[PDB]
Amino acid sequence: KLMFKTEGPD
Amino acid sequence: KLMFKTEGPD
Amino acid sequence: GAMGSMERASLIQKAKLAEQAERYEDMAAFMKGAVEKGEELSCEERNLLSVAYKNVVGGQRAAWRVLSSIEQKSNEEGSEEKGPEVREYREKVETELQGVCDTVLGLLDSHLIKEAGDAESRVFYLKMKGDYYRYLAEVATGDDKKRIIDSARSAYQEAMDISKKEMPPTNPIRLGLALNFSVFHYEIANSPEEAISLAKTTFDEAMADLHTLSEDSYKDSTLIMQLLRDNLTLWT
Amino acid sequence: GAMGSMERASLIQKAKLAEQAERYEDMAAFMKGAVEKGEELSCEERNLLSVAYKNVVGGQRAAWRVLSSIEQKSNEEGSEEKGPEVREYREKVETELQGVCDTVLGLLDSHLIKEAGDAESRVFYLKMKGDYYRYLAEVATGDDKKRIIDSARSAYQEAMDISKKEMPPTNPIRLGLALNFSVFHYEIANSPEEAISLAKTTFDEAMADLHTLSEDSYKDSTLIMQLLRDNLTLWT
Numbered sequence A, B: 001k002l003m004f005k006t007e008g009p010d
Numbered sequence C, D: 001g002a003m004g005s006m007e008r009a010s011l012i013q014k015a016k017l018a019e020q021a022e023r024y025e026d027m028a029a030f031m032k033g034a035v036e037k038g039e040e041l042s043c044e045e046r047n048l049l050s051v052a053y054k055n056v057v058g059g060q061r062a063a064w065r066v067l068s069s070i071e072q073k074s075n076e077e078g079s080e081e082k083g084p085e086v087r088e089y090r091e092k093v094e095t096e097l098q099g100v101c102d103t104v105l106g107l108l109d110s111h112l113i114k115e116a117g118d119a120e121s122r123v124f125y126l127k128m129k130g131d132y133y134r135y136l137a138e139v140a141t142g143d144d145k146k147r148i149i150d151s152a153r154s155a156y157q158e159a160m161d162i163s164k165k166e167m168p169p170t171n172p173i174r175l176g177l178a179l180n181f182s183v184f185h186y187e188i189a190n191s192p193e194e195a196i197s198l199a200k201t202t203f204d205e206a207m208a209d210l211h212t213l214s215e216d217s218y219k220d221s222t223l224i225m226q227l228l229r230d231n232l233t234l235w236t
Ligand SMILES: *SCc1cc(N[C@@H](C)CN)c2cc(C(=N)N)sc2c1
Pocket: C019, C043, C044, C045, C047, C048, C051, C172, C220
């Protein structure tokens, strides 16, 4: 799945 | 530590 | 619990060691133990808690998506049955993921959130509550998916209200909250226009407040602003 | 054990899924369960077993070295005492590492090695026995360090004898064995000249046998030959 940017690591 | 090459992953 | 006999300070020290060792399951257990000492957390301790569990659940989400994709491939037309194993193992990982989310939500509920009086702590914890309900929603499919989603929404919304009243637009906690809430909107709530609007407004109001910041705070805020832009570039 | 109620085939299938998900602790537990079904392992199943545990113990070794370095820093002259925590957590990781090595050695002893009649299986398992005694030796400091080292040496040496009698010089198992035995010599047994000699002879005898190989076998063998060269470049 294309993962969008969220806060923090990994 | 400088790790030398050994067989397989990681 | 398992960490009840270790000193709070030792648990925090060992959480920091585990982070350096990239032992995030250890890191999370130490920070769980520190939370259960019952004292409120410092800014650094909150971040140790979040980094630990974010790393643990991140591994589970990555694994779950791999297994879910295989499983969907194995249920498409023209596919050789391979038995229950893919579904079973996807369920195994999913159950462990849900257990981690339930553990984090338990810590927030008992009693981090109710004791968090300051905006920076209360917003941090409410954002985390929204995040871990969001991770639950990513794998939910049943009669509780809608309520899980609304739980995420409700937590994010309370955190947004407080942050808008109590924090500047460049506050990194406020910015990371808005980032994550916008992703919630985009792919959990299937509200892409809400997602885009939130990200644009968040970016623009931060940009107009950067002039008030030191060089160190500027670097913190612009780092998260770049994530907002990264998403907007894909969404528009 | 914990996996006693799952079918052998399902455990192997799930080991392969776990590998794709980068869930190596799961992968190792599934392959442990498959070994304990009591049947000998295929070439693919041996490699699944080795890859799983190599990934698990690799994480532990990386963490142990980080913690060991901190601990030595904290015991140098002019260093502010920080209490027992670094030592304690280094011991925690070390104990988990030793437990993994003991588990693998238990599988080899009960009863993979004694049932391995063919050279390719017996050499594979004896190499693994040498490897996991080597990982134990990396963290050993007490009255058993010398015997741990000799256990590694003895396993590697039996594997070398069989491989020299029964396998061509380009056989990837034979080459990986010689690679790892040479590293043993270099930094475990403090025999750098033995290490260098073994690596050179191994490389040169393989190089002279490459002409007998298909393109696919050539690629397999030269991949490990490059590791021999990489080490020789640092050692000479
Ligand atoms: S409140 C001081 C503080 C801030 C951070 N992270 C900032 C970039 C904002 N989240 C922080 C991260 C820590 C860690 N990964 N150990 S400790 C700490 C403290």
